[PDB]
Design a protein around this ligand. Structure first.
Ligand SMILES: Cc1ncnc2c1ncn2[C@@H]1O[C@H]([C@@H](C)O)[C@@H](O)[C@H]1O
Ligand SMILES: Cc1ncnc2c1ncn2[C@@H]1O[C@H]([C@@H](C)O)[C@@H](O)[C@H]1O
Ligand SMILES: Cc1ncnc2c1ncn2[C@@H]1O[C@H]([C@@H](C)O)[C@@H](O)[C@H]1O
Ligand SMILES: Cc1ncnc2c1ncn2[C@@H]1O[C@H]([C@@H](C)O)[C@@H](O)[C@H]1O
Ligand SMILES: Cc1ncnc2c1ncn2[C@@H]1O[C@H]([C@@H](C)O)[C@@H](O)[C@H]1O
Ligand SMILES: Cc1ncnc2c1ncn2[C@@H]1O[C@H]([C@@H](C)O)[C@@H](O)[C@H]1O
Lengths: 237, 237, 237, 237, 237, 237
């Protein structure tokens, strides 16, 4: 047991899927996992462990922001022997060619946070995902007929930033998606010798705004979870 | 309605109590508020509005970390006309004379986060609470026979920091409590012209560790909520 | 005796009022103190000790700037047993509602300096005043029929700054006054375990632009001094 | 022609391999390219163009350091229509498991330099390689029976650094190799919309300490070059 | 007249000697200047203008610290036509081979202050003295048989620095003397278009701990002043 | 022999002229040195040692950028007994009154590089040249009838800087020339205990856009070399 996870070694699988909103953990468990059992309820962060095609897998939300996901990823890594962490969620896009519902795989993650500088002697730490995990995700997406975009994400500390101009800079340097965790999770993974990957679906633009329906989000979201889950299987093979 | 709060102007009172763990919102509403009604459920962040001695008051969790509470405090301030925000929770202490269960009022908040430097041209912004709110809290504590400690809090981005030595520095400069939101909330309050205060009860030491029981936490926690609630009334008078 | 103070333990009271201008120290000693004796003249930084309504009090200039006042307050605290320091000066206003002759009390002080970062491992140290001294001042002002404003001051290293943009930032984040020592004095107080407070009268506006020089301006300066002196009396009771 | 390159559009292929040492460029052109013509000699920074298995390819030294390679890659991209740059060099190891003759592929590059901060408004820019080029290299290596390691490289400004402590930090966070250009080249590629990749062979260890100079060392260097060349072929198909 | 100088264009000469101590200016005007006339008394920062060997010369203290001397040097330059500023003060030595009473000419000035970074977009501005003034001072010294070292000074913001290790770094890089103004005077001179030079007398050793010694003060101080005054005449010629 | 210099103690003179361009070193050795002998060819960084007016002198390129020249200057100083390093290069002007072919002596060197901050605990290290070498160069120039400005240079890390505004700041502060090595050479000289000086020829104007002009290159370049060589003789005397 740990400060934020009321469970014992063995309760979580070596691979954990982590959605932003906690509510999605229960949904992932009953929609994609078989024989799911509850393994955590502290602070309302429901955790579940089950199997996907015989493969043991766990799922539990990580809350919003670098400080929150840094806590859970760390405890999962050092207290429950977790080897791989896959964050699944959404992001905003700044590039005109990146459309709503596109799938983005964060090979790297920029940030305006100071956590990595605190870890790296105030130098530039390239917060990156595990390469094999990125390629597994891309191939799994391909197998499902999905066109996945791979590149840099930007993990913001402030959803409501004072410097609106930074989005122009992000666009100029090819940032594919804007979210709030990747750089933090990649930092933790690097600090404790584990693997991580962030997968996001474009939720909106930071220019204008396309209009759709939850019907065009349901299975697009399901597509993302499918990608994450199938990518783990390719990783094992 | 906003991205994270599914409610309309008027749903929240001008004063909002915000506990770390969401679960505590429901508890505060049924234990201290009368005629409470549910006003938000997005992402599981239950919000409630009711009255305390005829005084309209709302309560809703703010999640863990500066990035999370920065989102909610901002939306409450700019979209729901909230005037005062009081964070209630716990903290770790580094000073030998600060004991478990002591009540700490954050007049100021240090941090290792970069959000305030991003707002203040990379200069030092003194993240402070509203003075009247601090004095109301102190007096209310006094009226309940509580001995309140007032000073600096430290809002950490990383609960599991690599630099263990920083705690020695915190002790040397008199930091009363270590938590993860104050500096963020004070920053937002300053950015959008509102008032904020953080009140914490010492949850543990960062040296050794005292041992008690949940029985000595129940009403100590209730004491804190009482302080927060009575402080609002003194503020109105 | 210390490098910049040619006196001996006992020559100063445990409470020291400190204006920026040494000539202002003599003015204060001649106007409010009974039987005031000069206790220091090194570098012309006049220091005086006398009694206010029976209480032993000292007053001494601290020069212009954080580097200057940091030396004097530090020597007063570590070598003359001074336990409280109250800076009494003038500041420039940035907020339109802050008028001339308004009394400002800095419970917090933002800064341009790098001194607190050197002290706080390059993180954000919230330079705050001692809570009881702030409250004593508010009450003394109230007793005198004066509405004091409590909030953030901005301590600048450059009276003639090359970036006029900061003033808008200061205004946006609610800085009540701009001066040049508070953040330095509060840093020292925390480093050596003492208590400090900065009280200022607005002598110049930068929002509407305006100076001051009249009987009314000098009446407000004297009120500020009475607030400082009366606040020490309340601190004792 | 540009300031440092005396050639004309067309003299270079759209793909350029770049070793640090110009003499190494001539070596590469003489060893793997057919009908290689010298296309630049300004400052002795030898550039060559020829064909590898029918494909037009160029190779040219980039000098030592981010400042140096930043100039050449930038001119190649904005004035010679170069669309891909593959740095082929050597790096020092920090991790005990990273042995001599191991082929390292930098999907990411940490740095000491301030160049990306100047570009990214002082925030953390994750300098990453183009995903397809990384995958092409992994597959080409596989086809050659070589196990390549993919991860972070560290680009240093000081080959002789005054702080030997960084090496432990680099090891702790899993840096695979230490060199001096990757972060610079990846910054340029993102700024001007091109694609880049850095491939290195470990020529020195800092964990166990050791150099190299043998037939086996030179065999591994040539393997790295074949990996680079074969990877461009796969990129076309 | 300016905010800190009650004088009129013409009251000051085009060259001004500035010691930290206001009382030293008075001593200089009475000892080396003829027909000396006091031109400023604001804040007790005594200012004098007289003649030396027929040359019109002024002398005025600048107070302690970068923020103080910056104000005065700025006002002299923009409102009184001052072209040359020569600081004549005391400094602490960190090098073993540098002894007390030694005269150091600061051709450069290091600092832990943020004033120059604020002026120079957060980059490294090399705060240097005017070459001819340095050359003049070295020559005037030879003609007086006085020894003088030319190199870097370090202008600290904290006389009571909590960072003792920094003195070792200063020693390693050859800092000849530690004072508190040079970097500021040079920053101001470059910003407002004037020329400046700092000449210091080693008053003590930061290592051996021992301020000014015996009556050797006045004598060595007089050497510095003589060197400063003579160097002004070489300049005119 | 060192990692980048295949020579032996004794092959280099105690003073070394270093241009950026390796081919320029060759030109200098053939044009100004007698009995010139090549002592290094590693990476094509040609090095020569001959005699000038009987004085043993060496000349070797240092490559482009701070990271490159730092390596070479360091190796020369610690393994070949080099006491004096004189960089002879080209620079870009930002001041209108500074024209092409002008000779500038860098007594100081600003920079946007982080190398000196890494050496100087993140503070401001004023990168300066050895006073006597500067004085020698100014004198040798007068004796040659050549004009020469003495002041600050700016050593940039990015020749293709995305920050155009910075040139205005450089102009405001009197930067005489923009190059890419000075701050590094001076940092190294101070770290490894040697003396250095940078003499530059204004090759173009960053504003007017126009590199070296006509055959005026060789002539002005020869003036710089002559000045450098003669200054070495003044030094010996
Ligand atoms: C402006 C901005 N900054 C940071 N993250 C942002 C953002 N806009 C959107 N996001 C990310 O997308 C999620 C929403 C849109 O579902 C959010 O949960 C979030 O992960
Ligand atoms: C080492 C450290 N860093 C930051 N915050 C800390 C901390 N130790 C404790 N806290 C704070 O106290 C809360 C726990 C103990 O209930 C936590 O929710 C948290 O607010
Ligand atoms: C622009 C600016 N910056 C910093 N401090 C300032 C300022 N304008 C005024 N002050 C403060 O007010 C004092 C004078 C003007 O009475 C000054 O001594 C000073 O304390
Ligand atoms: C300590 C250290 N720092 C930075 N790069 C280093 C290094 N040690 C080795 N390298 C890299 O390996 C190349 C040489 C040694 O073959 C060098 O050219 C270089 O790319
Ligand atoms: C350790 C240390 N740090 C900074 N300045 C120091 C010093 N030791 C001596 N000095 C200098 O002498 C002046 C003192 C007397 O205020 C200062 O203005 C300065 O010129
Ligand atoms: C705009 C700009 N920035 C930096 N260096 C510049 C420059 N314009 C010219 N120079 C200088 O000349 C060298 C070129 C030829 O590589 C560089 O080494 C340098 O000495």
């Amino acid at each position: 047991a740990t400060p934020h996870i009321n469970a014992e070694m063995g309760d979580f699988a070596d691979v954990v899927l982590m959605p932003g909103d906690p509510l999605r953990a229960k949904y992932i468990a009953e929609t994609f996992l078989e024989d799911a059992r509850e393994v955590n309820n502290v602070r309302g962060m429901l955790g579940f462990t089950g199997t996907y095609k015989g493969r043991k897998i766990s799922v539990m939300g990580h809350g919003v922001g670098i400080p929150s996901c840094s806590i859970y990823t760390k405890e999962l890594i050092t207290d429950f022997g977790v080897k791989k962490i896959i964050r699944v969620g959404s992001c905003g896009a700044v590039l005109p060619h990146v459309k709503l519902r596109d799938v983005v795989i964060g090979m790297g993650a920029c940030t305006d946070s100071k956590v990595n500088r605190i870890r790296f002697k105030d130098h530039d730490f390239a917060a990156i995902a595990d390469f094999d995990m990125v390629r597994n995700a891309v191939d799994a997406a391909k197998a499902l007929g999905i066109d996945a975009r791979v590149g840099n994400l930007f993990s913001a500390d402030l959803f409501y930033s004072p410097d609106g101009e930074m989005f122009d800079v992000m666009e100029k340097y090819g940032i594919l998606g804007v979210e709030m965790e990747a750089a933090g999770i990649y930092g933790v993974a690097a600090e404790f010798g584990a693997k991580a990957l962030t997968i996001c679906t474009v939720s909106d633009h930071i220019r204008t705004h396309e209009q759709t329906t939850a019907a065009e989000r349901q299975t697009t979201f399901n597509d993302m979870i499918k990608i994450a889950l199938e990518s783990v299987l390719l990783g094992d093979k």
